[PDB]
Scaffold this active site. Structure first.
Site, PDB file in Angstrom:
ATOM      1  N   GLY A 137       9.097  17.016 -14.896  1.00  0.00           N
ATOM      2  CA  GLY A 137       8.013  17.794 -15.226  1.00  0.00           C
ATOM      3  C   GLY A 137       6.735  17.023 -15.530  1.00  0.00           C
ATOM      4  O   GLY A 137       6.587  15.943 -15.370  1.00  0.00           O
ATOM      5  N   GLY A 138       5.790  17.942 -16.434  1.00  0.00           N
ATOM      6  CA  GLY A 138       4.759  17.309 -16.783  1.00  0.00           C
ATOM      7  C   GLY A 138       5.087  15.771 -17.567  1.00  0.00           C
ATOM      8  O   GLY A 138       4.219  14.871 -17.443  1.00  0.00           O
ATOM      9  N   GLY A 152      -9.820 -11.697   5.617  1.00  0.00           N
ATOM     10  CA  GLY A 152      -9.639 -10.907   4.184  1.00  0.00           C
ATOM     11  C   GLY A 152      -8.680 -11.046   3.207  1.00  0.00           C
ATOM     12  O   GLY A 152      -9.335 -11.312   2.067  1.00  0.00           O
ATOM     13  N   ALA A 153      -7.659 -11.194   3.693  1.00  0.00           N
ATOM     14  CA  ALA A 153      -6.558 -11.549   2.668  1.00  0.00           C
ATOM     15  C   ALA A 153      -6.606 -12.699   1.821  1.00  0.00           C
ATOM     16  O   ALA A 153      -7.108 -12.760   0.609  1.00  0.00           O
ATOM     17  CB  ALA A 153      -5.187 -11.880   3.398  1.00  0.00           C
TER      18      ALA A 153
END
Ligand code: BTI
Ligand code: BTI
Lengths: 85, 506, 177
Positions: free
Chosen positions: B165-166, B400-401
């Site tokens: 949960g939270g 790019g890399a």
């Protein structure tokens, strides 16, 4: 052998060590079937006897402390409250 | 008063000897036993030992245990102060209440006021339902604290039981998440609701078990074999970390030489470019006593993130793994390294980036998945980082890399290259087909055009003529080059423009 | 009292202005009653010591040995003034006021029955005059064995050597005079 260091491949260093410690090799009473007789199931590994485990235990224990003490010398520790080994 | 001693010992019993066994039954240690192994032998000082909850609904007030479900306080790890809380599952399931959180906040607030890490040992059934919104508020104050301390004091989360949960959102925001192989798990929504809403039937372990998280979700940083090694490895981790964002990485003795040469390295890059090699070999040989504490090993395996020391100081490391996806950069590898880089920077830990990336991993799955954003994260991380940055390109550095991997354009300090390095816009082949269109119908032209691009651009020298690679070195000397490179940057100081905070893609 | 207050108040501020930590050993009943005190301005002088601890940011460790009642309790480096360690001896008694007076206020229609109030007090005493209700609340970080105080306090300060706390920006304070 104990000092021969090999890494990266699989090797028989432990196996060799094993036969060097094998009584029959020690007594010289060996035949040409020795290998086949003594290691019928391939190399089943080697295992130390008490007085061996004992010596090793002590050494590791001795080395471990050495290393542990070093973790203790980290900078930034509470002045009068360092870790005590 | 020996009455005190009794109360004390009473509290120490948690949910009782019967439940303690239950716990031990699941191979799980108790809250206190975990604390006991985490902190320097006899150095733990406990706080709020007799705290009791303030609930009055559902007859909750008839069951007011001491400690209210969590063990908090401080102690030392190798003599350095550390703040801690271990949830006591045997007490009201170690369920979070108004007061259980308060206890955690007290030491979080103390960790921050004194500049010391916070180790969280989560082993809780979740919120204390009977408390209503007070349980929610309880979480809230922890979260808030978790957030304010982000990058100010190291927050190591240890999951050793359930986390549902939270709750998950707290460890989510800490700097590290470690899980214990089989006894732990975590998920926002339970398996049973997953059924009633998805009609899907899955077991807690499948849904959010140590494995699922250490290699599928990208949530945990490692799954330890059991409670004991879990604790041991955490101190190991702490020994590398600075106590807060003010001081720099801790220092300690080191029985190794900054001038060590590994000739073995000179042949690590295979001749054939289609044959991998294990980038990790390099890491160990460079690493100080060959020690390399890896983070998220079992996830995004096409990239490696970890810690090592050099001359006894902490150095973070990001490096490409040829063995997986051919060292491609991809959404996950990106997210994985990106945060590592950011944490190391936020805490003055230098970076060593070892490079051999071909480009990014192609695919509809990647594009629809948002590599445009995730991919940028790592780029963003190196662009932002200002700690000292040393780089060594072992082989491939294309397009790019190439740029993303701590390039010189991201203002890295040292941009070293092995002679086997090849930095270029893209491979010789593709490059050629674009540069020479009217030549494809002549398979000997393009066969030759490629052979020239290859012979003229696939190397580190064109990049050297430009200054992009500060130097091309002999592989065996890397350890020596890199060690002193960092040594000389110990004083580095660089300023980023003022701003409340960054806006990195999410 | 006015004087004891003015006396400690300044001590605290000097030690704080100069990064010297504070150890506060407590056993206070309350303030000294009197026309002399009120007409003398305890409302202002009394506050000074309170102000001092409220303002202080050096490391603050506290050990209540016995009495800690009401307003004075709060003033003596309480946890509400943001002290770091609030230790207590088992003999500590932290409460709104003494069992007696407490009782007369909480149980009005019960005075004409000298056994009700004799019992009502005997309960407040048994239930509130101690350090444990404050413990349940977190206001006393721990209850310790008297003999170990030196040990407790010493390391408590040790771990606070790095403390660093920020008060809001201001030219200067406006403490009562
Ligand atoms: C060879 O089989 C064709 C070339 C394949 C391209 C490879 S796949 C991953 C690398 N990054 C990229 O965009 N192209 C490279
Ligand atoms: C006996 O209990 C007579 C009443 C005395 C009350 C004491 S005198 C000082 C303490 N502070 C205070 O205001 N009243 C307490």
């Amino acid at each position: 052998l104990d000092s021969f260091e090999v890494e990266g491949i699989g090797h028989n260093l432990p196996f060799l060590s094993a036969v060097m410690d094998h009584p029959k090799f020690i007594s010289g009473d060996m035949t040409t079937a020795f290998i086949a007789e003594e290691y019928p199931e391939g190399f089943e590994g080697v295992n130390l006897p008490e007085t061996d485990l004992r010596r090793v235990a002590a050494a590791a224990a001795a080395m471990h402390r050495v290393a542990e003490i070093r973790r203790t010398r980290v900078s930034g520790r509470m002045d009068n409250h360092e870790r005590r080994v | 008063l020996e009455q005190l001693e009794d109360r004390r010992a009473a509290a120490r019993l948690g949910g009782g000897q019967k439940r303690i066994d239950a716990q031990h039954g699941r191979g799980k240690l108790t809250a206190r036993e975990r604390v006991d192994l985490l902190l320097d032998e006899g150095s733990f000082e406990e706080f709020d030992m007799f705290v009791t909850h303030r609930c009055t609904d559902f007859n909750m007030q008839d069951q007011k245990p001491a400690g209210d479900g969590v063990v908090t306080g401080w102690g030392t790890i190798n003599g350095r102060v550390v703040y801690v809380f271990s949830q006591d599952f045997t007490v009201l399931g170690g369920s979070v209440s108004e007061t259980h959180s308060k206890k955690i906040c007290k030491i979080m607030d103390m960790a921050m006021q004194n500049g010391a890490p916070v180790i969280g040992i989560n082993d809780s059934g979740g919120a204390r339902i009977q408390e209503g919104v007070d349980s929610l508020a309880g979480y809230g104050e922890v979260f808030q604290r978790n957030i304010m301390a982000s990058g100010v004091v190291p927050q190591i989360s240890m999951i050793m039981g359930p986390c549902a949960g939270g709750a998950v959102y707290s460890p989510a925001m800490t700097d590290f998440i470690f899980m214990v192989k089989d006894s732990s798990y975590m998920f926002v929504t339970g398996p049973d609701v997953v059924k009633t809403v998805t009609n899907e039937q899955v077991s807690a372990e499948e849904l959010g078990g140590a494995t699922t998280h250490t290699r599928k979700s990208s949530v945990a940083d490692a799954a330890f074999e059991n409670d004991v090694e879990a604790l041991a490895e955490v101190r190991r981790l702490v020994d590398f970390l600075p106590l807060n964002n003010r001081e720099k990485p801790p220092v300690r003795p080191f029985f190794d030489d900054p001038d060590r040469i590994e000739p073995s390295l000179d042949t690590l890059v295979p001749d054939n470019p289609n044959t991998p090699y294990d980038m990790k070999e390099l890491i160990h040989k460079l690493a100080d006593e060959g020690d390399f504490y890896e983070i998220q090993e079992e996830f995004a395996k096409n990239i490696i993130t970890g810690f090592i020391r050099l001359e006894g100081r902490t150095v973070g490391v990001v490096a490409n793994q040829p063995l997986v996806l051919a060292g491609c950069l991809d959404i996950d590898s990106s997210r994985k390294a990106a945060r590592f880089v950011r944490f190391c920077d936020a805490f003055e830990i230098p970076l060593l980036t070892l490079i051999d990336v071909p480009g990014f991993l192609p695919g509809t799955s990647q594009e629809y998945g948002g590599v445009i954003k995730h991919g940028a994260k790592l780029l963003y991380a190196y662009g932002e980082a200002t700690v000292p940055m040393v780089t060594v390109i072992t082989r491939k550095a294309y397009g790019g890399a190439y740029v993303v991997m701590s390039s010189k354009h991201l203002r890295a300090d040292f941009n070293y290259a092995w002679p086997t390095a090849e930095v270029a816009v893209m491979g010789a082949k593709g490059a050629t087909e674009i540069i020479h269109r009217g030549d494809l119908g002549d398979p000997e032209k393009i066969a030759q055009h490629t052979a020239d691009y290859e012979e003229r651009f696939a190397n580190p020298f064109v990049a050297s003529e430009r200054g992009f690679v500060d130097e091309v070195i002999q592989p065996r000397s890397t350890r020596k080059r890199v060690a002193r490179a960092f040594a000389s940057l110990r004083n580095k100081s660089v300023q980023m423009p003022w701003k409340k905070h960054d806006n990195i893609p999410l």
